[PDB]
Symmetry: none
Subunit: 203 residues, 6 copies
């Protein structure tokens, strides 16, 4: 599977992002409160700050409660989650935690580790970081544009996909003279052509 | 050759396009290896580096292998071009050569010229490089008809005047048409295709 | 014919300019005032702002009146032109308009459309803009210097000319160690060598 | 192939290294000149540019000349590689080919990735390029075991788990050892060398 | 070889020059095609890429074609070098090779060193590259005699001492001569030319 | 002999310096005062400002007095040198002058004359300045790092040495992920590997 696609301009500005796979959860689990975990709101998301209870790591996010899917730091009831799990009344609860989606800042931070050395215009232009849970591919073009793709470790075709996104990008620029390279990409035909290129690459 | 015909609106956004980026083969010669032509990988294109023999030219790309379509650096089957030509089992082979498919960098380079023209803009105007020539006809109303071609293609002038006529016919028949919206019109598509055929025969 | 030659440094500074052809006029025409054209002073030049009378476009400049050649925004009589053509007394007049010479800002603006993308040091280095009335050739060197030449559409040799100017430029730099690359070129032998290179290219 | 095994401390400083940058020859073919292989100088390395004949590959470097070790661009004797192959007196010669020795730029490129990983860092993690793959195992205590290899080398995973075991044995026996100080320990050196041998046979 | 002799005034402006940028041919070999030498266009110079045969060297440029002078990438007649060597009608041809004419980039590179020397400056001093060596003798009065040469040219030291003697003779005989003005003096030109001849024979 | 080795980062920051040969003196000479030379303190060093007495040029530094080696602008007695040679009591003196070692600013200034033109990432990367008394070699890498070596005019091997320092540098960076390229190099194994590379190059 392919989790995410994003594009960074030569000045480190995020210019396009598409989260493909998003419901990367696990399972709803019951917990007898007082909760043996310490939670923090980080960038509109409720993360596990401390405690490694059976199954749960620090860095895990809360994704749902009892059915009420977590709308970031709010419940589906509109109520605030940190006061809700600190709420004595609803002590026996079911909570869904999984590895959260990357913030835009995180996407940038991750992108900044590739091609940091060689000047703009230095045989494939692809650098990568691989873990247990994902593989990140970063293609830098001649003029410093970075195309990044996040996918499970053993996903084939990413090299060709990245070149194709560039092909879609450069064609978009040529057909749309209003567009300047620092600008966010906001074009229907781009979205269409990318989603298709992803479909091809998935198979 | 003509690589693309497209229509850009006053605000600089695409409203109609017709692409023909896939080239036609220029040269076809049968080879009896040791291969009297030297090849190198260049951005996933197999280019001729040396040995401009009668027909082929230093800079042409390997388009087809004995008739079959090859994409990137691998054959129709799926073996690497270079790792299949110095082959003891396989040696006698015919190859098609010509201008490579249009690249991203090239597209980006032209985009960068065209965008600049659009912004500095204050008749037919043409942007040219060694390998490309972009022709732009702008109407009073700010509609731009663009033809992307190689430096030598003739009769674009007349092609552009035709697209103008066809667009005018479309605009007269569809006066209350959102200019930010793409042109969805069979007859338009039809007549533009026919107009391109004429220019391609020229 | 070749209309103009100029050189831009890697930082977008105009470093040399020579207007070759200059009397690009048309013919003196009589006009019964009140004048059916709206005129504006733009960058020391009297341009046609509005009105497209028989022969005259907007953007056309005033180049002479009755014989008194227009010294920019003044007449040969020292009198101001906008008050002179608004002057009731001299209502029946003869005026010469043609496409004005490029301002230095215009030269720069035009130069900024070429090689804007690829970084300094990215097979000929020549990019061009062609119209009915002129063709503009822009050569970018390894170190970002732009040599620009303005000439009628079907003028041959410009590619070779541009390389020669570079040859003259680089030799000038080598013989003149005081010279630094951001500086305006002010050298007699340069002017001599260029005017000669133009002469060769014209033929 | 495995190019380097090293141990980095929590603060990011080197505390142990074992280098094996000198490659083993991949291909060996005897040539009867006119030489059916084209060579170019590239940062004081003689690389094969064209003619991927059965065995050798476009990109391999000339490692040895008829058995003897050649350094940079000069022979074991001291004559220039290129100025000795088109030789009327000397023509029949055997040559060894394979991956060139690791370059500075390459090292610097990986360093730039590794440093960035170290700084952004907030399991085994791997950094990869076309020609390199760096494997990094970080302990709870922040000790990093790093193996530098080509993209295809297998069994680094197990090698890294072994170095972890050997380092753990060392740390248990030497609990009050300055972590800023290099590891000076024969048995450590011994066991790591043996562990690398296993991974190299794999 | 000596490419240029010139005199720079205290303020860093040119006051006298004598150029000899056009090279002499180093090697001349008759060829019987298929041509046993591979050529590439490089900034409008035809350079030898591969095949350093007895005489010629990888990096030399094609200077002349069967005796006649060729400029840029076209022959004395006006046909393209490459598009005339793989010719079925034309094959047997002799070619002259050697150091290419001095380029703009090279000139600019040296200029950038020389200018820097001039500005940082606070005896004979020499600036050197792989292919160039610039020799600069500065007088008490700040007059600079400069000789541009390749790294191996000998006896520039003595040539520079001679130009100093000749300039001194000129300055003694013309004491009230504007140092911002170019040197217009037949005898000066004469004696410097003779001095260069001696250094060129050396 | 090799006098000095230093390394400059791509932003013109001095990142490592090692003065190899240092006691580059001449001989102690007697002078009957009032001293016929004018001396100035420049950057913690006592230089000859004016006067060219038999043997001594302007630019020569004072390196010792009567045995008391000059600790920059102080004597081995702790006393200030400019007041000491202007001191009437000790008028008959012996003074040692020779060409001073390069200040860090001088090292930078000298380095700034090489590779100033071509952009970062433009066949050996070595540029040099040669005089009677020294030859300076400057190697610029792909990413703008300058390695500089100062040595007597006819010293062989410098090209290979410079490449080796780069090899040592790049390896140091790879083994030390804390290190960032703008930082001063402060590592024992680096010093060891360099001093060895110098030893090889000397022979």
């Amino acid at each position: 599977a392919i989790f995410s696609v994003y594009v960074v301009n030569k000045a480190g500005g995020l210019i396009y992002q598409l989260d493909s796979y998003a419901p990367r959860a696990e399972a709803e689990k019951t917990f007898s409160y007082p909760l043996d975990l310490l939670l923090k709101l980080h960038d509109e998301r409720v993360l596990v700050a401390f405690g490694q209870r059976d199954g749960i790591r620090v860095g895990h996010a809360v994704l749902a409660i009892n059915g009420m899917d977590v709308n970031g730091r709010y419940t589906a009831d509109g109520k605030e989650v940190l006061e809700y799990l600190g709420n004595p009344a609803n002590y026996p609860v079911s909570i869904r935690f999984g590895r959260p989606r990357l913030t835009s800042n995180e996407k940038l931070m991750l992108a900044s580790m590739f091609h940091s050395l060689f000047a703009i215009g230095s045989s494939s232009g692809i650098e990568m970081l691989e873990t247990d849970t994902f593989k990140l591919h970063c293609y830098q073009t001649l003029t410093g544009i970075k195309f990044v793709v996040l996918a499970d470790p053993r996903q084939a075709g990413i090299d060709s996909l990245l070149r194709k996104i560039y092909e879609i990008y450069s064609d978009f620029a040529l057909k749309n003279p209003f567009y300047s390279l620092e600008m966010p990409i906001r074009c229907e035909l781009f979205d269409q052509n990318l989603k298709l290129a992803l479909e091809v690459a998935e198979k």
